Amino acid sequence: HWGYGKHNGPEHWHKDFPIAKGERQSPVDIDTHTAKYDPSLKPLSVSYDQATSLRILNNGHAFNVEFDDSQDKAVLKGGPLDGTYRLIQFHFHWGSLDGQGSEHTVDKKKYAAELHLVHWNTKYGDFGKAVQQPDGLAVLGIFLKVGSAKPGLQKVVDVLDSIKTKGKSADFTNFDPRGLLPESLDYWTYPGSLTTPPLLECVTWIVLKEPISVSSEQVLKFRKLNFNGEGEPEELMVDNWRPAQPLKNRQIKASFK
Ligand SMILES: [N]S(=O)(=O)[C][C][C][C]C1234B567B89%10B%11%12%13B85%14B%1158B%12%11%15B%139%12B%1061B%12%112C5%153B%14874
Ligand SMILES: [Zn+2]
Numbered sequence: 001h002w003g004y005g006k007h008n009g010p011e012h013w014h015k016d017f018p019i020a021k022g023e024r025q026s027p028v029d030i031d032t033h034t035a036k037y038d039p040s041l042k043p044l045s046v047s048y049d050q051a052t053s054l055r056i057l058n059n060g061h062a063f064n065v066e067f068d069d070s071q072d073k074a075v076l077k078g079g080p081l082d083g084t085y086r087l088i089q090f091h092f093h094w095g096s097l098d099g100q101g102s103e104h105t106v107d108k109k110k111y112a113a114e115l116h117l118v119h120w121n122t123k124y125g126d127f128g129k130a131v132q133q134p135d136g137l138a139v140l141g142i143f144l145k146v147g148s149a150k151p152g153l154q155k156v157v158d159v160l161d162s163i164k165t166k167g168k169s170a171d172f173t174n175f176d177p178r179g180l181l182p183e184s185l186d187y188w189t190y191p192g193s194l195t196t197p198p199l200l201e202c203v204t205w206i207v208l209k210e211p212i213s214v215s216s217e218q219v220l221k222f223r224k225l226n227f228n229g230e231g232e233p234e235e236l237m238v239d240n241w242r243p244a245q246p247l248k249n250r251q252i253k254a255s256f257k
Pocket of ligand 1 (some may be wrong): 089118193196
């Protein structure tokens with residue numbers, strides 16, 4: 001099955017998922033000089049005050065912090081978006097070393113990690129219908145650099161010991177994702193895809209310019225997770241990122257001057 005190794009990693013994915021070589025694949029390099037300021041873009045509206053987390057899951061690729069998305073609580077709107085997008089989960093991509101791990105790059109710079117807050121367009125009723133539509137998802141991407149600790153991340157870090165291996169989950173209630181946001185909501189945006197199989201071309205990407213800082217100790221704990229299941233040989237969960245894909249016929253827009 002697909003993964004991140006030499007034998008099943010991103011360069012192989014096109015065999016089972018031919019859209020891997022499509023016209024609107026993610027991630028991409030953000031060339032900051034070429035991205036055009038778009039004064040028609042709106043400030044992003046991130047409303048996470050009533051977000052209700054439920055559970056954290058090691059799915060064998062990453063860990064997912066899952067939300068109750070049965071009501072309209074935690075929503076993303078504005079920015080480049082038409083309508084209302086409901087938060088379903090977040091997860092990260094990270095490296096084996098601090099010099100790699102992000103999926104998007106900025107002028108070819110790789111960050112140590114990247115957080116993805118995934119939201120589905122409520123006009124399609126459920127996520128499974130949304131991912132079949134070109135405007136079905138909005139993913140808010142936030143870069144992580146290593147420096148000062150992020151206090152709002154520590155509750156996630158501390159639960160990781162309990163979901164070390166693939167298929168383990170733990171109750172994970174009352175986590176507030178506001179504590180993972182940087183100060184500024186300045187962003188770049190472009191049309192793209194899921195960055196994991198099935199690689200569906202259903203995402204409006206919104207990538208924040210300002211990274212968050214996390215400590216070396218925090219990212220080291222990400223790197224103790226395992227891709228393997230319990231009672232299998234240990235494969236550290238590191239380098240679970242897809243490299244930048246061709247931009248093709250797309251424009252990256254900036255919300256800021
Ligand atoms: N790296 S990425 O965010 O581009 C795709 C990884 C999350 C994929 C999804 B999980 B939830 B729903 B489940 B189904 B819908 B929503 B998030 B997306 C899909 B699965
Ligand atoms: Zn992701």
